[PDB]
Structure formats: C-alpha cells, structure tokens
Design an enzyme around this catalytic site. Structure first.
Site, mmCIF file in Angstrom:
data_model
loop_
_atom_site.group_PDB
_atom_site.id
_atom_site.type_symbol
_atom_site.label_atom_id
_atom_site.label_comp_id
_atom_site.label_asym_id
_atom_site.label_seq_id
_atom_site.Cartn_x
_atom_site.Cartn_y
_atom_site.Cartn_z
ATOM 1 N N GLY A 133 -52.511 -118.928 29.880
ATOM 2 C CA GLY A 133 -51.266 -119.456 29.340
ATOM 3 C C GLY A 133 -50.625 -120.415 30.315
ATOM 4 N N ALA B 89 -49.227 -119.476 33.157
ATOM 5 C CA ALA B 89 -49.240 -118.823 34.466
ATOM 6 C C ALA B 89 -47.917 -118.116 34.765
ATOM 7 C CB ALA B 89 -49.587 -119.828 35.569
ATOM 8 N N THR B 90 -47.617 -117.103 33.950
ATOM 9 C CA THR B 90 -46.466 -116.249 34.221
ATOM 10 C C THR B 90 -46.748 -115.251 35.338
ATOM 11 O OG1 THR B 90 -46.068 -116.405 31.840
ATOM 12 C CG2 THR B 90 -44.651 -114.934 33.103
ATOM 13 N N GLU C 13 -58.501 -120.898 30.943
ATOM 14 C CA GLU C 13 -57.637 -121.462 29.915
ATOM 15 C C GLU C 13 -58.262 -122.753 29.405
ATOM 16 O OE1 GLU C 13 -55.852 -121.204 27.514
ATOM 17 O OE2 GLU C 13 -53.776 -121.069 28.187
ATOM 18 N N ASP D 14 -63.995 -122.011 29.346
ATOM 19 C CA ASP D 14 -63.807 -120.983 28.331
ATOM 20 C C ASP D 14 -64.263 -119.620 28.836
ATOM 21 O OD1 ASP D 14 -63.353 -119.615 26.007
ATOM 22 O OD2 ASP D 14 -64.905 -120.625 24.830
ATOM 23 N N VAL D 15 -63.645 -118.568 28.294
ATOM 24 C CA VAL D 15 -63.980 -117.207 28.694
ATOM 25 C C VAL D 15 -65.378 -116.812 28.240
ATOM 26 C CG1 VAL D 15 -63.164 -115.954 26.670
ATOM 27 C CG2 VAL D 15 -62.968 -114.917 28.925
ATOM 28 N N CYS E 60 -53.111 -113.038 19.317
ATOM 29 C CA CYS E 60 -52.753 -112.130 18.235
ATOM 30 C C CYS E 60 -52.728 -112.815 16.875
ATOM 31 C CB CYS E 60 -51.397 -111.483 18.519
ATOM 32 S SG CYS E 60 -50.031 -112.658 18.601
ATOM 33 N N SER F 211 -45.762 -116.658 24.895
ATOM 34 C CA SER F 211 -45.897 -116.283 26.292
ATOM 35 C C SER F 211 -45.385 -114.863 26.515
ATOM 36 C CB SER F 211 -45.159 -117.280 27.182
ATOM 37 O OG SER F 211 -43.759 -117.095 27.110
ATOM 38 N N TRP F 212 -45.375 -114.437 27.774
ATOM 39 C CA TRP F 212 -44.861 -113.131 28.152
ATOM 40 C C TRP F 212 -43.366 -113.243 28.440
ATOM 41 C CZ3 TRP F 212 -49.322 -111.433 31.933
ATOM 42 C CH2 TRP F 212 -50.364 -110.903 31.173
#
Ligand SMILES: Nc1ncnc2c1ncn2[C@@H]1O[C@H](CSCC[C@H](N)C(=O)O)[C@@H](O)[C@H]1O
Ligand SMILES: Nc1ncnc2c1ncn2[C@@H]1O[C@H](CSCC[C@H](N)C(=O)O)[C@@H](O)[C@H]1O
Ligand SMILES: [Zn+2]
Ligand SMILES: [Zn+2]
Ligand SMILES: [Zn+2]
Ligand SMILES: [Zn+2]
Ligand SMILES: [Zn+2]
Ligand SMILES: [Zn+2]
Ligand SMILES: [Zn+2]
Ligand SMILES: [Zn+2]
Ligand SMILES: [Zn+2]
Ligand SMILES: [Zn+2]
Ligand SMILES: [Zn+2]
Ligand SMILES: [Zn+2]
Lengths: 327, 122, 430, 427, 256
Positions: D170, D172-173, D192, D214-215, D238, D407-408
């Site tokens: 995201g 970077a929180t 990311e 990519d993951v 989600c 985000s968080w």
C-alpha cells in the site's frame, strides 16, 4: 410553454396577457411590452432595447416590430410609418395566416395606422406614446443624485464663454453658440483619428496644454453603407474614453466654485453593456430626446424639460444665457 | 460567400422598395465588382438597372420577379421614361436569359408560359 | 527602396556600412538598430520586432525568424537551452547562396548564436547582445515623461503599518511577499470573483484579508469607508490584449476594458491637494501586445514601463511590463543566495532534470526523466519554480488542471520581492 | 417451532422469559444471546447477524434491521449520530399492535436506542450493551486453539535493528508507524504493483524501502537471499470477500485467492526447528464477510482473531479483524493525548462540522452558510496520516481518496505494535 | 508475422495446429479451450458448428472460416502444451510395510491397486480396513500426530478446482516429514486438462513442480487427458494409469 398555449388561454379569457413573453411565449416576464398587451421575458427585453430603433438605408425598419427578429418581413405601404411585421407573428397573434394570404393581394396598411381593433389575441394598447418613452429612459439598476445647481450671476459680472469640443462635426458647436448671440472668444476643437484652434490627433494633447490653454467652461463631445447597422459590430469605446480623460484633465480643482458644464451624446442603438458603463463612469443617467433618437448625458440646467440635429442642440444650450455674457 | 443560411444568392433577380421611389428591378452582384464594398454580414449587394449605382439592402425584405403582375406600375411607366427604359432592359435580360416592348410585356404578363421562371436561374 | 541582394552586394564589395539599411527588408533611413546583429532597422520593422520577439510555440520553440520575424519555413536550432529558429531566405542572401540545403542535411545543426562567432559574410553577431537587448525593449520609445518625485525620509519612530488595496487579487501574492519581508500589515482589501482563489487566500492566511465583490460594483463612498490607503496594486486580465489570441478585441473592447477600472479607482484613493503622506502604486501587463496599446496605456498612466525577465532570479522565462512610482524601480537585478536558479533545485527525490531553464506555462513531455522514463512536472515542482511555498495550492479538492491554471497567470515571488524591497524605509517593520 | 406472537403473549402473561426464544424468528433452543436487547438467538440467525450488523448504506444509514436483520420497510432514526433503522414487523409484535402507523407521522421520531431506557412491553434494552457487544464478536466462536508461546525477554544490550517483510504494502503505513514509535529499522522489503503507491513510498521515505515485483513471482530462493526476517505483515485485498459485492466469489476463487500467498510465504521465512530467535506475524481483513470464510482463515492460521474498532481512537467507523501472535493483542484499547477524537479537530479554517463522528469511508461541513464536502487534507487527518501525504504524482481527488479508503489506521497499528520495543533496538 | 486464427497484425506466436501466426489473444485461448466442444480447430471460431465424427476425420471446418482460409502435427502440438514457461529445476533392505493418507476416497481406488501389487497395506485413512472418520474440515495437528507418521499422500479430482486443491495442500504440509530427515515420502495430484490457465499456473507454483501430460487416446478409447504432479520416479518417461504409476514404487519399500 408554447406560444399557442397563451393564445388558447386568451381565447378562453381565463388569464391576463402579461404572464408570458409576447415575442417568445416563455412565461416569467420581467417587464411590459411598450406597444402591445403582453409581458417581456428577460432575454427578450434586452434585444428590444437595441434593435427597436434601427432603420436601414432604405428608410424602413430593420427588424420585426413585435419580436425584433427578422427572417421574412412584410411592409407597411403607408409613408411616414416605416414599420414592418414578422411572418409568424401575423399567424400566431392574429390567429392564422389569413392576413398573410390577403397581405400580398393588395397594398397593405400596418396595425399602427388603421383604427384600433383587437385583431385576435393581439391588442394595440390605447396609450403607447408615453409608456414607450418611460420604457427606455427608466427602469435601470442605478440611482444617483441630482447635480448641484450653481447660483445665477447678475449681468454686471458676466464674461465670454470658453469651449473645448470633441464633436464629430468640427464646427457644429460653433454655429449654435453664434445663433444664440453668446460671447464666444475661446474655442479649441479636435477629433478622434485612426478663433477656432483646430488640432488633429487628440492623441497629441497633453496635460500641460490643457493647463496653458485653459481654464475652460464647457466640455462637449460624443459625435458606410449602413451607418446604423455597423455601429453594433464596430463599437464606441474609443470615442468615450478620450473625452473622459480630457474631462478629468480640465475639471475644476477642489476649493473652486466657478460654474462648469459638460455633455456627452450617443445614439440609442447600442449594446446594453455600454450604457451601464457610461452611466457608471459619468455618474449620471441619460435623457432621450426625439427630433433620430439619441441619449444625452450632462449637467446642463433644465435638461429633462419638455420640448417646446441643430434644433436639439439649440434647445439643450438655451438655458446658458443667464450665466455667460451675451453678444 | 453569402453562405449565412439565407436564400437569394448570387445571380438572382429580385424586386425592391425605396422610400420616395417605387418597385425597381435590380441585379445581384459581388462585392469585388462593386467600387467599394465589404460584403456586409446578413445583407446582399444589388445593382439597379438604368442607373448603374450599387446598393446594399437586407435580404429579408427581398422578393423575386415571379409575381410580375403583383409589382407592376402603369402610371409610373407612363409618366416616366426611365421606368419604361428599365422595364425594357429587364424584359430584354429575361428574354436573353432563356416602343417595341409590347410583345415581351405580354409575354411576361402571361406567366412565361410554357417555359416558366426556370430559365431565370444563373 | 532597394533589395536585400543589392545591399548585400554593396556591403560585401566594401562600399557601404551595415548601419545604413534594414536587415529585414533591405530599405534605407533606419530609425533604430538591430539588437542581436550589426545593422539598422526601419520604422515598420521595429513594430514587428517589438511585439513578436518574445512569442513562443507550444513546442518550446521560437515562433518566427530571429532576423526578420517573418518566415515561410523555419530551420530550428538543435541544441537545447537555445530555442531559436532561422529563416530560409535570410541565410542564402546574407551568408551565402545555396546554404539552406547544405545546412538542412547537417546534423546536429547549430545556429549562429551558439557556435563561436565568425563573420559569415554579413552575419556579424554582436559582442554585447545581452546588454543591448535590454535597452531595445526598455528605451527608445515615442514620448518621454517627467520622473516621479521622491518622498522625504521618515525616521524609525514615526512609522505606521501599511494599508493596501489590491485589484484582481488572485491567490494573494502581495500579502505573502509583504509578510515575508517583515513589514507590518494594518489592512488588506482584495477584489476577486473566482471561488477557488478566495478559498486559497482564506485558508492560507487565516482570514486577515477583507474580501469584497466584483470591481464594477465599487463606488465612490466605499473608498472612503475602507480607506485611507497607502499602496494600490493591480494586474488586469490580458486575455484580449495578447497576440496569442487570433480574435483579440484589444483595448477599449471586451475584457481589455478592465484597465479603465484600475485607472478609475486609482484616482479616487489618491491623496487630495495639500496632503503629503506617501502614496505608491503599481500596474503590470505582458510584453506581447500591440505597440499602440502600450503607447496608450503609457499615455493614460503618464509613465514608461520597465521590462523585467524572471530568468535572472528563477528557472523560467517570463517577461512583463511594470508601470508605477515605487522607489528604485529600475535598479539592476541581482539574484539572491536562496534563489533556486535551475530546474534541478526544484525537483523531487530521484528525478533528473534534462534542461536547466524551462519555458513559461518530445517538447512538453521531455523536461524530466525518472527511472529511465520521460515524465512531466508535478504541481509541487511548479510551486517551487514560481517561488511559492510548497503545498500552497492544495486547497478545495482541485486537481492538476485547476492548480496549473491558477499558477500560470499569477505573479512571480522573486520579482515582486525585488520590487517591494525598498518599501521598508517608509513603513513600520518587524 | 412457534412464531413471534405466541412468544410475546407468553412473556406478557408472565409465564416465560425472553432468554428462551429467538427474537428474530420466534423459535426455541437458543445458542447465544442478543447483544443489544434481552433474549436469545437461534443458530441460523447468528450467521445472519454477524455478517450484516456492520454493513452500512451509502446514505450514512444502517442497511438492515437492528433486531432481526431482515426487513421489508425501514424506519430510519432521526437523531444525528444515530443511523439505526428498525423493522416494521418487529414493532407491532413486540411493543404492541398499532404502532407502525402511529410512529410514521411522529416528527422528530427517535428510536429506542436514543430515548431513556424503558420496558416498552417486551422490548427491554440492555444496560451493558457496550460491554457484551464486544464479547459477542471476539468470543463465542466455533473452535478453540491453544495459547501463544511467549518469548523470553532480551536485555537492552543484546538487541538488533528489526528486519521487516511487507506484502501488499500500500502506501507504507507500517514503516511510518515503526519510525514514529522510535524503533530502528534495518531492512524493509515491500511488494506492491500500483504505480501511484510506489511513488508515495519512494518520495516520502527517501528511498529506504526496497521495492519488488508482484507477490506471485517470489520464490523460495528470494526469501533466503533477502532474509532473515523478524516481522512478517500483510493484508489481502477485500474486493472479493465483502458482502458489498453482489457477485463475490469468496475464498478459493477470484482475487480472494491472494490470502494463500501470505500463508505460503509465511512458512518460508519462519525459523527452522531448533532455533530460539523471536518471530512475529500479523494478518488483517474486514469484518463484514461471510462466516464460513472466517473459520477457514482461522483454521489455516491456527489462531482466533480480535476485533478493534477505529471509533475509540479516531473520528470514523472502521471495524477490522486482526490475526497474529503479537504480545498483548487483546488488552483494552485506550486513547492517547494527541488523538483528534472528534470531527471538529480535523477541519480547516472557518468550517463547522454538523456531525461529530463520520460513517465508514454534502452533509458533514457547512461553510459560509452553504453545505460542503470534506477536502483531501481533511481525510488525511481523520486517518492519522501527516497532512499533504498523498500530494504526489499529479493525482487529484478521485485517486487520492481511493488510496486512503483502502488503507489501515495509524492509531490502531500503533496500539498493536507498541510492545515490540522490548525486543528490538530503539532510538 | 500475421495471425491466422484471428488475423490481427503484430503477431509473435504461431497457431499450434499448423502453419500460421497467432496473435496475443489467439494463443491464450488456443491452449485454454482446446478440449465435444463446438469450436473450430484452426480459426478457433465457436459461432457455427459442423458435425463430423468420421474415423480419423473429426476436424469440422467452421462456416465462417470457409472464406477466412480456403477463400509437425504430432511433434509440435505436444511440445506447446507441455512447455515449461517457468523452469523449476528439481528432478527429485527389510523395510516397513506401507501406510497411506488419502483424499477423494471415492470407491477407495488406492486400496485395490496397492493390494494387487503383492505388498500388504498397513493402514488406510480416508477423508471422505478402511478407516473413514469425517470430512477434511475436522482434522487437526493432533489428529495427524496421533495417526502419524505416514508414507505417501494421494489426492485429486477427475464450484472450482481450488476448494479441494488448497485443502490437499494444507494436509500435505501437515503430513510432510520434518526438516533434516531421510525417510521416504511420495505424493501425487490429479486433475483434468479442462481448466483455466491461472489454475494450472497456481498449482504448478505452489507444489514447486511442473506437470506432465497423460492421454487416454493411447491406452484407451475415450478422451481422458489429465495433468499429473508428484515426485514418484517415472513420469518423465482409468485404473491402468495408476497401476502403471504404482508399479515402480516397490524399489524403495519393504523387500526382505
Ligand atoms: N470583474 C472582475 N472583478 C474582480 N476580479 C476579476 C474580475 N475579472 C477577472 N478578475 C480576476 O483577475 C485576475 C487576473 S489574473 C491576475 C492575478 C494576480 N495578478 C495574481 O497575483 O495572481 C483573475 O484571476 C480573475 O479572477
Ligand atoms: N498482485 C499483487 N501483487 C502485489 N500487490 C498487490 C497485488 N494486487 C493488489 N496489490 C496491492 O495490495 C493493496 C491492498 S490495499 C491494502 C493497503 C495497505 N495494507 C495499507 O496499509 O494501506 C493494494 O493497494 C494493491 O495495490
Ligand atoms: Zn421570450
Ligand atoms: Zn416577428
Ligand atoms: Zn403603418
Ligand atoms: Zn525594415
Ligand atoms: Zn527570416
Ligand atoms: Zn542555437
Ligand atoms: Zn432465529
Ligand atoms: Zn426486523
Ligand atoms: Zn436513534
Ligand atoms: Zn493467430
Ligand atoms: Zn475455422
Ligand atoms: Zn480430413
């Protein structure tokens, strides 16, 4: 709503004709039609203030006398009445095209000539020569104060006049002052290019020249197939602002109480935005005079009095005899 | 030019009306042929017959010579030599378009039968 | 009325001087000099050089010929930081016949202002072209006016905070510059109709600016209600005054009429006779406008303008005219130690600037390379280029287009600071 | 299997208790309790209450019925900061017949959660709903697992900088929170694929984050090349697990398969047997998701989640599920002294907030007497980010709001990561 | 460098059927929907279907493809459908009897094939002598530790292919021998060729082993094609398929 809806309601006699735009049929009017019985919408009344007084070189009316929008104009055969009428107005406000069918068969007299009669949902209002006058030179979004009236002077202390002019005609203001027997003796003329001390190219007059040549006592100004229709597409900005600049130059300084008069002149057929600008910059409101209708800004004494263009200028300048020496 | 959405383009023949005058034939020309012109927006440039002057009137109040009988003036023609001359020039121009004016005058009064007014097109 | 070929033959044959004819049309009796090369200019060619010299293309290149300002086809200079382009016929008649084709295939071609100067026939580049280009645009006008009168000095004990009236305020550059200098502001009245500039000026300065309505509704009594004023500034919209508009109405018409609103409201607020308190004013406009309009604006305001280019204090070309009576308006411009004078100092992290000085707001997508890819400038980099605080226009949800539009018509902080600096000796500071 | 009216008559006649039937269908054999009112809940109604109690409408109002979560016509509450909507049939069968029509003309009507509590027949609001509501979601699950194994403390002389691997990074929180806590970071590898989020993490943190692809292209050798790792975090998208999607494929399908990438790469970086170095992890997802998936995620991860609502420390509603083994995960949440807890503390100059707490992210703000919306620099303050954080790369309101929306929340993560300072170096 | 099935320009691939370029999207659907589908073989058009079931002649030309075309078959077709886009470079007396963990019990296909080999089977633990307990959802680490250790894991299938694949992955990860050990351990998966490309890529990525192709057209008379995974020796070279794959495992198991 449609234009036929208003005619249907009038035929039912269930409402007043002042509820919609007589020219467009749109409801929510803002003013009154000065000639006939009906209301004027906001967008349909601005066009009435410009094109209603426009005559072509032929001597006939340029646009419709009802909606001021010309696409097919039928003419008035009677002289001294150059009115012309639209092509769909005569079918909607009268009821049908029967008048148009009979229009071309024989010479035709317009609705302003024949004795008054309600030709359907179109009724010639009884009085128009006064509310038409009040329609133009009133009902504006500005309100200023009356000019300060200078006290009169006895004839024992009267001196010759001093005139600075910027009219179209170079010597137009000179002859009028001579017919009245007023003591001339200072006169400076000029023009907007692209005893009379003629000087061309008003672009060359400086503040120091105004200081030396002065003091002044009257500042005037305001002034090719279709001189009447080219005015809107050309503009009158150049003519106003140099007169304004020189009026600022020559105006008496604070602490001086000597008389000072001025006047500006312009035609009626001009855009709605220019009249507001001139009124705001000059801080006054015009008065129309009919001989060729024309607007007049100024502070001359008794300017809106009833009439009792050389004659118009003579009428305007007449009350100056009791301030400056005559003969 | 003159593509402003109005009718009566170049080369058409129409009538006219002048204060202090009567109905007079005219010829539609271009601004280039005019001594001084600029093709004023929304109008048309015309030239009178028998005078040679250039005039610029609006196109809305223009009528063609289709209804010849509806725009005739017997008194003006009789009392003015210029009116008769202009009528003669108009008749000659119409005939070529494809006191000896009587035969073509009767030809025009009859409605250009059987050719009609289709031969007046440029 | 000779031809260019005849003049070139005469000068080449060592029978005439370059300063007798016009380089653009080969005429006689010149009224001025060519600022870039040796020669003279006739009357009708100055009025073509004055208006059209600083005009630029959308591709970051000069729009006309550098010699005659009238070209059929143009030969663009290839070196960056020099955006000049030369005329097809200006070469073969002045440097030598048949050179256009030879130079056309040459790559990378260099114009005559880049390479070390050589007397290529009659193209003798001047030695001090920079010194004389300023004098061409600043002096040699039509009329001359009397210099403004200085005001007597005020001792440090009898100084008061300044009261300012601002017309066509924008995003309030004057307040920001006056606060950055340490001058104590007593009042600040602003006239503006845009709904986003008002938002920026209200959020950023915590509502110390008293906003009013459109300039056409301000009356005589309002000036006395709000005044007295000590500084009247304003810059009129130039939408209908520039040459970039093919349908320009010019002065006296359209939106060019708004100069007369400034002229009208400056006379109301001026001190009356017998009063000697200090009063200052300033007006601004563009250089790319007709000579008649400039000579008229000078006539109404009764002063000649000074030309200041932002290239001497920042990293962009932006030339403007300034009318006013501020003290020391025409002293030489010197840069400061905190001025970001290059495009590299105004970039974010991990960005490389290929140019050094950008044009005003592979040409518009080629100023910056990032991670091996061509990029454009960010809004926060335009803010640094113009000299504003970063994140100054981050107000009211507007995106890239609105922020860029608001910044593109604003003033330049390092220039307005240079003009306002000598005001500290007249009003209370700190 | 009786209905609601017989149960209401029985309880009114003083012969039965509310805790013996289900208030949503009137059945018998309860398995739990209604968190809000008094009574019991049957088996098949909890699986509908859990998935839908937190869903909210675009109009800032609750989506389904408050009592049974199944309604035909809704009666929206009128009190501000109360978005509750009731059920038509829930009224006349519980409080008394003839109340649906009477209340519809009541202005301003207030729900039973606003007015002082009273026994309106059988509708008895509980006096400790704020306490049992938390236990309704946190506890009373399907299966139970063992407790985590606490690691022994480490003296302040034998501590090293932390090494972090982040998946679906995201903006970077985690890096921002770790740097605000004072912990010393020795490495931060982030995965990311959004071009605008990579620009934010590169410019703002001066290129200390090492970005990867990519993951789905990370292999066994990469983990041991970049490792070792002491903290492994991540949160899966989600877009295919929430009930807001009418065509959601759920787990095992669509973009919800990205959870198993986290589970796969968590095994690679886990210490081998016979090693005693500290190792922590944490997975995060939304609460408004199908119950069947919630027990599946817990089964693979072997632990039960905790639920933390961002409303106790911020000015917005955002409920999330946190898995992990961090020390002290379920301690009570307490606000700090620097937390802007009301909407008025997150506004610009000369703006007035009509509300005090904003629903999940023209009404909220009135400016100069005219209604307005929230600016981009006001949503950064609500979530806890520094102001002007997303002013990067020419994006406007459309793209900045999308980055913040998924985000968080900074105070929540700062609450979770706080006890990590006793194992790694500080300052 | 022009496409044949689609005809799009800028082609860099070729149609597996015969000569003719393949566009970017042509090759994506070429191996995705190869396998009675009413789709053309060359033009890959599913608009109009033609019926043709003649022996060795089943290629029915598409009606719309009549004007498109008209106006290494056994060598290149196999290679394109088994090429490794991702190279996972890894090839890998008197013993104990065999105990096997299984998924997808069905009719207990493993029991009879293990018994018919001549080696006794120790314990069978089904999850669908048979010891069936419950579904996969009710198996824990404690259950594996109680019933463990094991020797091999078998699972596979003849609304999706992931809901069981991930369960098999979880069970295999639980049942894997601990690190640092030499005990034998085999496993294999089973699924049909008719699958999406993403599913195949994900399954090959998670198991860390590329698949092999087994076709029934050479061992039977029905269109049964299956991909295989595992570490049993012999894939690099319908119950007969599992019999063939289970024949060699006697090498590493009980032989006195
Ligand atoms: N009629 C009017 N009354 C007041 N402001 C006006 C106006 N018409 C235009 N303007 C404003 O005048 C501005 C001119 S652009 C100049 C901006 C200003 N000089 C600066 O420092 O940024 C425009 O932003 C426009 O919003
Ligand atoms: N295939 C993929 N590989 C790597 N990252 C991906 C991905 N698909 C989606 N993502 C990223 O995963 C993120 C999930 S949104 C979560 C944001 C992050 N947890 C935070 O703290 O803000 C999205 O921003 C998206 O950019
Ligand atoms: Zn109307
Ligand atoms: Zn009409
Ligand atoms: Zn009449
Ligand atoms: Zn010249
Ligand atoms: Zn040239
Ligand atoms: Zn150059
Ligand atoms: Zn129930
Ligand atoms: Zn309900
Ligand atoms: Zn309520
Ligand atoms: Zn192809
Ligand atoms: Zn085909
Ligand atoms: Zn065949």
């Amino acid at each position: 709503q449609s234009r036929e809806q208003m005619a249907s309601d009038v035929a039912n006699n269930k409402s007043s004709l002042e509820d919609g735009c007589l020219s467009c049929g749109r409801k929510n009017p803002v003013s009154f039609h000065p000639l006939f019985e009906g209301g004027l919408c906001q967008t349909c009344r601005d066009r009435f203030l410009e094109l209603f007084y426009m005559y072509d070189d032929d001597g006939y009316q340029s646009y419709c006398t009802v909606c001021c929008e010309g696409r097919e104009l039928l003419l008035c055969s009677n002289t001294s009445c150059c009115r012309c009428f639209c092509v769909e107005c005569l079918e909607v406000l009268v009821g049908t095209g029967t008048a148009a069918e009979a229009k071309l068969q024989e010479p035709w007299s317009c609705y302003m000539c024949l004795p008054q009669r309600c030709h359907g949902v179109l009724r010639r209002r009884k009085d128009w020569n006064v509310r038409l006058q009040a329609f133009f030179t009133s009902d504006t979004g500005l309100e200023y104060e009356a000019p300060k009236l200078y006290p009169a002077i006895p004839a024992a202390r009267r001196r010759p006049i001093r005139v600075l002019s910027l009219f179209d005609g170079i010597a137009t203001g000179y002859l009028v002052l001579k017919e009245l027997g007023i003591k001339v003796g200072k006169y400076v003329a000029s023009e907007v290019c692209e005893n009379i001390k003629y000087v061309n190219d008003v672009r060359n007059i400086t503040k120091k020249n105004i200081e030396e040549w002065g003091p002044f006592d009257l500042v005037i100004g305001g002034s090719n197939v279709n001189p009447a229709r080219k005015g809107l597409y050309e503009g009158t900005g150049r003519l106003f602002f140099e007169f304004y600049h020189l009026l600022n130059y020559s105006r008496p300084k604070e602490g001086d109480d000597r008389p000072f008069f001025w006047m500006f002149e312009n035609v009626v057929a001009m855009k709605v935005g220019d009249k507001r600008d001139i009124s705001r910059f000059l801080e006054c409101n015009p008065v129309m005079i009919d001989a060729r209708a024309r607007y007049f800004w100024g502070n001359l004494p008794g300017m809106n009095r009833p009439v009792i263009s050389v004659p118009v200028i003579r009428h305007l300048f007449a009350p100056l005899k009791d301030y400056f020496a005559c003969e």
